[PDB]
Design a protein around this ligand. Structure first.
Ligand code: WQS
Ligand code: CL
Ligand code: MN
Ligand code: ZN
Ligand code: ZN
Length: 455
């Protein structure tokens, strides 16, 4: 009645042996956790990274948030509180809201009340929160190299579960991306307060994410398995269509608060958890999630991409094209960069990249045959990776070009991808040029190097 908590998501308590390698561990739990979209991970009892900060010296710009179900909110893009003054505001807010010690309010009650207040139009509750990547003003909650570190800190510098490391690690396919994608490869820092909330979303390029709660009151999560992503979006579009009006940029993606009971009513499977200090939440590819903080806290989260994700990554970019949605990076560029580094690639990585590359090459072969039959005859090699991203998006579908594109002297600087040859200009196709990064004869040896490395 009124609010029925979703069933609990899986919770894992790995031994230190199981825990040591996060990528091995994530791969192990995948058959279970991809069915629920999110899962929780409790590290071994003595895995205890040191949390130490001067609350008077850490400062950040607060963002403001109204809390209305189905109301459009904008995805965060990369006034002032110190961590102390924010904490004081946060604690007083919760304490005053409930007239209870800021810290004796049941999680069940805060959850019940959250879903009441967002549904009630008469209530006009606004809260504040922090969200940004690490900076000199507010750095990672994990140890980073710089300052003389304690031995305790040195211990956790190179941990696989130190989220600063997760990007640059071997089994992380986003590592070799030479592109500047700060928003994606770097951890985000999240100072929370009671009710401050993250709207339903999936990660860019359907990547994984992992979220660590450094300290404070719990974070309440709702998660949906990747297999039900389109079900959820259909429910969303029926109840909040304005969210789906085509977004002009990557800086105007619209998201919203929605009661999980509403999804469950529409046969969307939803799972929940309360993440407490010292615990991880992991989200799987295309797994929708949302949630809110129980009180003053501090979390850190990062995207990552395992070899498992590679085929989904390709599918995601296809899906972005259909939606005319901007890409954070070129998937094909990433694949070719790894192929060009085949000799230093992890061997399982090499094997999986090889498979995606084969698909890429066969798709590219067919697209080029199609545009040749449309009367495009001239061609010239073009180093797409040198162009700023906004200078190599398809005019029509906004995909980031890399393997090839069509240009015309008529429309200087404009490009279309090979799916949209007819969308560039009114000139006849013999005026067009196929701009390509690699010939098919360049590509097969690159793929062969991967095969040799994979043995
Ligand atoms: O990992 C998460 O998605 C949750 C994370 C979080 O703790 N707060 C917040 C705010 C906006 C976001 F887009 C994402 C988040
Ligand atoms: Cl409200
Ligand atoms: Mn997320
Ligand atoms: Zn296109
Ligand atoms: Zn033209």
């Amino acid at each position: 009645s009124m609010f029925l908590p979703p069933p609990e998501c899986p919770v894992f308590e790995p031994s230190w042996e199981e825990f040591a390698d996060p990528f091995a561990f994530i791969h192990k739990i995948r058959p279970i956790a991809e069915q629920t979209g999110i899962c929780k991970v409790r590290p071994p009892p003595d895995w205890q990274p040191p949390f130490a900060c001067d609350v008077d010296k850490l400062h950040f710009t607060p963002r403001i948030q109204r809390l209305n179900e189905l109301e459009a909110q904008t995805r965060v893009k990369l006034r002032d509180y110190t961590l102390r003054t924010f904490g004081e505001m946060a604690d007083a807010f919760k304490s005053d809201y409930f007239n209870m010690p800021v810290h004796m309010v049941p999680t069940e009650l805060v959850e019940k009340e959250f879903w009441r207040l967002v549904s009630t139009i008469e209530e006009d509750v606004t809260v504040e929160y922090g969200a940004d990547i690490a900076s000199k003003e507010f750095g990672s909650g994990f140890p980073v190299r710089d300052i003389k570190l304690s031995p305790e800190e040195e211990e956790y510098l190179d941990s696989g579960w130190n989220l600063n490391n997760m990007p640059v690690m071997e089994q992380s396919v986003l590592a070799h991306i030479t592109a500047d994608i700060c928003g994606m490869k770097l951890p985000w820092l999240y100072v929370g307060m009671c009710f401050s909330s993250f709207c339903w979303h999936i990660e860019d390029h359907w990547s994984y994410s992992i979220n660590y709660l450094h300290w404070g009151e719990p974070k309440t999560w709702y998660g949906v398995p990747g297999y039900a992503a389109e079900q959820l979006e259909n429910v969303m579009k029926k109840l909040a269509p304005e969210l789906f009006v085509s977004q002009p940029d990557l800086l105007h993606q619209l998201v919203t608060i929605m009661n999980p009971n509403t999804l469950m009513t529409h046969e969307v499977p939803v799972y929940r958890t309360n993440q407490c200090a010292g615990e991880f939440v992991i989200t799987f590819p295309r797994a929708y999630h949302s949630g809110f903080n129980q009180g003053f806290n501090f979390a850190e989260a990062v995207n990552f991409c395992t070899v498992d994700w590679l085929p989904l990554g390709r599918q995601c970019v296809e899906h972005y094209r259909l939606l005319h949605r901007y890409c954070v990076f070129s998937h094909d560029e990433m694949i070719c960069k790894m192929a060009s580094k085949a000799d230093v690639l992890d061997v399982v990585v090499a094997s999986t990249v090889q498979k995606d590359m084969a698909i890429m090459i066969e798709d590219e072969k067919a697209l080029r045959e199609t545009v040749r039959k449309l009367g495009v005859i001239d061609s010239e090699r073009m180093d797409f990776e040198l162009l700023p991203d906004d200078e190599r998006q398809c005019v029509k579908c906004k995909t980031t070009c890399f393997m090839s594109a069509i240009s015309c002297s008529c429309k200087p600087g404009l490009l279309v991808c090979l799916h949209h040859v007819k969308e560039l200009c009114s000139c006849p196709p013999y005026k067009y040029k196929l701009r390509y990064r690699y010939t098919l004869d360049d590509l097969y040896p690159m793929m062969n190097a991967l095969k040799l490395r994979a043995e």
